[PDB]
From Swiss-Prot, chains C, F:
Residues at the active site: S88 (nucleophile), H113
Catalytic activity, as annotated: Hydrolysis of proteins to small peptides in the presence of ATP and magnesium. alpha-casein is the usual test substrate. In the absence of ATP, only oligopeptides shorter than five residues are hydrolyzed (such as succinyl-Leu-Tyr-|-NHMec, and Leu-Tyr-Leu-|-Tyr-Trp, in which cleavage of the -Tyr-|-Leu- and -Tyr-|-Trp bonds also occurs)
Name the UniProt record assigns to this protein: ATP-dependent Clp protease proteolytic subunit, mitochondrial
UniProt keyword annotations, A-Z: Acetylation, Deafness, Disease variant, Hydrolase, Mitochondrion, Protease, Serine protease, Transit peptide
Organism whose genome encodes this protein: Homo sapiens
Family of the protein in this entry: Belongs to the peptidase S14 family.
EC number(s) recorded for this UniProt protein: 3.4.21.92
Outcome (variant: S88 to A/C): Abolishes protease activity
Annotated positions of the N6-succinyllysine modification: K135
Domain of life according to the entry: Eukaryota
UniProtKB/Swiss-Prot annotation, chains D, E:
Subunit-level organization: Fourteen CLPP subunits assemble into 2 heptameric rings which stack back to back to give a disk-like structure with a central cavity. Component of the ClpXP complex formed by the assembly of two CLPP heptameric rings with two CLPX hexameric rings, giving rise to a symmetrical structure with two central CLPP rings flanked by a CLPX ring at either end of the complex.
Organism, scientific name: Homo sapiens (Human)
Catalytic activity: Hydrolysis of proteins to small peptides in the presence of ATP and magnesium. alpha-casein is the usual test substrate. In the absence of ATP, only oligopeptides shorter than five residues are hydrolyzed (such as succinyl-Leu-Tyr-|-NHMec, and Leu-Tyr-Leu-|-Tyr-Trp, in which cleavage of the -Tyr-|-Leu- and -Tyr-|-Trp bonds also occurs)
Modified residues (N6-succinyllysine): K135
EC id: 3.4.21.92
This protein's UniProt keywords: Acetylation, Deafness, Disease variant, Hydrolase, Mitochondrion, Protease, Serine protease, Transit peptide
Catalytic site: S88 (nucleophile), H113
Gene for this chain: CLPP
UniProt subcellular location: Mitochondrion matrix
Protein name: ATP-dependent Clp protease proteolytic subunit, mitochondrial
Residue numbers bearing the N6-acetyllysine modification: K146
GO cellular component, one term: mitochondrion
Amino acid sequence: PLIPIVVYDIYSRLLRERIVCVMGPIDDSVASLVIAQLLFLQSESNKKPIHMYINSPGGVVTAGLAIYDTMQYILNPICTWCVGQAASMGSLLLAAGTPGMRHSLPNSRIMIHQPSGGARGQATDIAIQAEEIMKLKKQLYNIYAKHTKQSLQVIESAMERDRYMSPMEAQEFGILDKVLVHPPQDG
Amino acid sequence: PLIPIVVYDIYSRLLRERIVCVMGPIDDSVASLVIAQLLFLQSESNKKPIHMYINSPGGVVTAGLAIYDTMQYILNPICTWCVGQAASMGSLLLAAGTPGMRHSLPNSRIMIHQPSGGARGQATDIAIQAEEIMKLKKQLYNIYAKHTKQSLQVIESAMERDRYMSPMEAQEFGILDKVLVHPPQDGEDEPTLVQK
Amino acid sequence: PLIPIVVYDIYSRLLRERIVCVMGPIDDSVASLVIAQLLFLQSESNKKPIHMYINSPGGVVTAGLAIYDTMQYILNPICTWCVGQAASMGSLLLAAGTPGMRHSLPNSRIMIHQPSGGARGQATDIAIQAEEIMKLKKQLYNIYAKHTKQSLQVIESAMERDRYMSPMEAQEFGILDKVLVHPP
Amino acid sequence: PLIPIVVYDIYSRLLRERIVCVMGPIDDSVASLVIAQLLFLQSESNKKPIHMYINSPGGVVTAGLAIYDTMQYILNPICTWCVGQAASMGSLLLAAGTPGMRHSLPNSRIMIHQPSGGARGQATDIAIQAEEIMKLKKQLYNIYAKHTKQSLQVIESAMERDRYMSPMEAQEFGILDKVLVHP
Amino acid sequence: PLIPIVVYDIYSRLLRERIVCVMGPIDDSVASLVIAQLLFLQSESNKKPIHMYINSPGGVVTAGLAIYDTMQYILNPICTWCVGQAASMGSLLLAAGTPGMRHSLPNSRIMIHQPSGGARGQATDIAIQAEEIMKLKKQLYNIYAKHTKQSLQVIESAMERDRYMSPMEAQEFGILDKVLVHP
Amino acid sequence: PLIPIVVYDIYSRLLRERIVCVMGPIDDSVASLVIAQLLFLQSESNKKPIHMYINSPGGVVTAGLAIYDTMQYILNPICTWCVGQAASMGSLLLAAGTPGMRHSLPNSRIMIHQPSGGARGQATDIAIQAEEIMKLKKQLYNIYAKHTKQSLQVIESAMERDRYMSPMEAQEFGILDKVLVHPP
Amino acid sequence: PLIPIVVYDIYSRLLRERIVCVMGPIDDSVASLVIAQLLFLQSESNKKPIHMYINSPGGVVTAGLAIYDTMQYILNPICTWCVGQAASMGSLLLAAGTPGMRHSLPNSRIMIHQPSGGARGQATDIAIQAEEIMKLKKQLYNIYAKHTKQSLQVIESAMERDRYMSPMEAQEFGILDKVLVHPPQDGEDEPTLV
């Protein structure tokens, strides 16, 4: 419903204010675009905070890890902002913002859960695949444990199945630091 | 294909007039575009009113809530205008405008109803998805109750099934404030409204 | 598909002359473009006439009503022109032009008929949907009665089924005012 | 992929020469473009002739009648040229050129015939659709009769079935005035 | 995608050199575009020869005839060049170049054959359609005869089925005049 | 999407360097562009060499022959480079570069084989089609014979089935002149 | 959906900083773009380093070798960077960077394995295709052996089936040299490594 300009382009305008938008299912194409922008912003300044607006239902694990690693790698402080929802890999990126700079609008929703996937072929191949998704699951569990400050035991139990959370529950859990407060209505 | 030009882009031009269009099914891409525009407009002025033209059959709940939260979070007064129809999440955004600034043309139609969805998997997973969908229902119900000032009892009873409303019925319900016939006519200071 | 560029594009060139083109099926997408243009033109001048060239088989009801309401809302005189055809919601918009400013080329055709749609689900939902479409029907009937000055009875009888009209019949019915005459 | 950029574009350049192209099937979008160009050219000048290059297999009747009315409505002399073919509604447009200004290249072909359509639903609706298509047929017949100067009887006989014509045969029938080889 | 731009677009720049490209299947869209270009190049210069590069598997008969007639109409001399292949209507355009100015590269291939199509409906309509394609067949045959100087018997026999020709075989047949290796 | 822009489109940029890229399946569309670019570079200068980078699984015979004839037509020396692969018609173009200027990267792979096709219709039509492809087969064999300097007997025996070659086997065969890991 | 326009297109903007992005499945199309960009950066400067960002599940073997050979052909040193994953042909391009300039972030994943494909037709044709894919297999094993410094036996054994490796396991294997945590931090001359 193909895109504003003002002025460039509405999204390019936000980038100008060091804002990167992560919207929709995460895949290599999205990861690639987001990473390109983050690296660009660090290039303009490796000290100024970078803002990440997040509204995603999740996506490809490795694609999500690529964004995650890039966020952690650049020197810039990173503020994450949950808009609408941050599910699956989306909540990992939200929780991955610089401590004390992870926010959420009051009506957004967060969701975490173990990864899913597929394996087919000879028994030998199945075994190799099952081992890899298992390493992937433990990897994700440690990352969440690290940013939420929760123990592995808690992470493991909480991610066995889909675990939905309100902004407040997410703050308590350790995924975000601030649940934004709406100003008074002008009427 | 479609879009004009004026003097960007017909839509970009109205944006320069602080007009934001919410048209068609609401989803993540739509929400993203609308949100980016609202933030941009507040940036230009956190005082100047913002106009939101709404003609939508509804869409994704979380996407709707992302727009709603942004509307409530920015400081600007927001005038919502219902044109054609504001159904489901569309009517939530309509009712979410600044009190006293929620409009509709005389032949638009409003519709509100509980959310819908799907669940699939083991019984445990289905129980988890049901619990979540019920939370969404209650959340949306509290939001409507707040902006329409109706009691939860009234909301629950009105949204159990599809509930269509004329602009005036929506005004009475608390979804809208004014049904306009014309903007300020020659010599008049105020717009002409549909009288009850 | 559409377009020559000019001196922007041909359609944008017409817009400069305060002409808005309603071509093809009417849906939320077309209504949004048309309304955007109407609003734009009113901001340019809320007194100068605005021309709406119409060649449409019809479209979505609420989408049509959106355009209809916008045409009535703005302060500008609205001149309507039937080119090719104005069927269903297309004829409602033709008839909604300012009285005395609704035109049609001599070989165009007009068509009116009640609305159509679907209903599905439990009996309760079907009843709710049936009730809604009947309201849309009545609502459209009142709008046609208002602009054609025909009684509701006449409108009801005339729209129960597809009703085609030549420009002259449409003029007599009250859908338009002037049937254009070709030069020598 | 397809359109050349000129000194934009190749077609826009021809428009500068008061040349309008009617190519391919005729539908609502094609009519709108064609019509907008015609009106534009009139405002540019209501005296200078307009050239309409026609190569179409035909198309939607109301869309064709839209172009036709517009051609008759503007004051400009309209020179029509049949290139490749002018079949069905395409041929009605060819014949609607200003008298004495309807042309055709040597190997083009013209075709005229009554309208075709469809209809389904209740009998009441089928009757309504039949009555309407019948009106369209008579309407088109009278227009061919007018511009060809043939009797209604002759038109009725000639269009009952697909009737193809060479440029010379179309000239004699009154569809066009001249078959040109070179300028 | 495709399209390098220059110093516009690669093809647009070739037009500057009076080079019109006839590529791929020939249909109404390709014909109109080619005709516009031909006309265009006539304006700027009504004497300067136009170069038409051809690599086509063929296409719609009327569409090809539209291009053919325009080639004959304009006064500009026309050098046709067979690149890759000139089959069906493409071979007709090749042969329609100005005498002495029809060329082919060493490894191109030419092909000619009668037209194909389809008839459908009541017997009456099938006869009408059959008569019409038979006319198109004889019309095309007469055009090949004119430009190749072959008798009608020769053409009818050579086109009853697909007939492939080497550049030299095509020159001998009268489809083209020169087979160049270098400029 | 898959686009970069400099200084414009990355390819338009390389063309400024007199570099023509033959990528993907070879068809009439690919050939038209290639030939257009070649003709452009010759006009810019008929003495300056042209660089054709080839990465293709092959394609339409007549399309490949069009590019082949153009290469031999223009006066410019043409350096061919096999990148990734030069299969079927692609290998023909690689071998058609100016003698002594046909290159290949170390790990590219070359492949040659007789033409393939289809045919349906009456027995008479099948015979005509069969006769035609056999002719295309002989024509290609002669072309390879000419540029590789191999006898027809050798070409016929080598192309009866898909024949894969490493850059060196291809040089030895006469399809290219140098295999380069780094610039000389 | 599309790409934000800085100051133009983000990727073009990075290409101006001598950065080439190899993302998604590798095919002739992606290989052409990459090779075109690499050659462009050489024209600009056949001396200034070139950065290759890699996040790919793999792709067409010949397409990947086209990129590989180009990387080796250009004079300028190439720094490879793995984010997300560098699987199959992707891991080959990663290992093909200038020695000492092959990197990865902490959570990327690497994978190597022998090539796959299909064969069909007369027995004679199947044999020809079988022989070709086996040559391809050995060709790739040689390339890996050369850049990882592993013996052909280790390579053959490790690639028979899909072999996944963490960045640190890949560094030990010889696919990459450094696993970065941060580029040079405030006051530090060198980047921080795992």
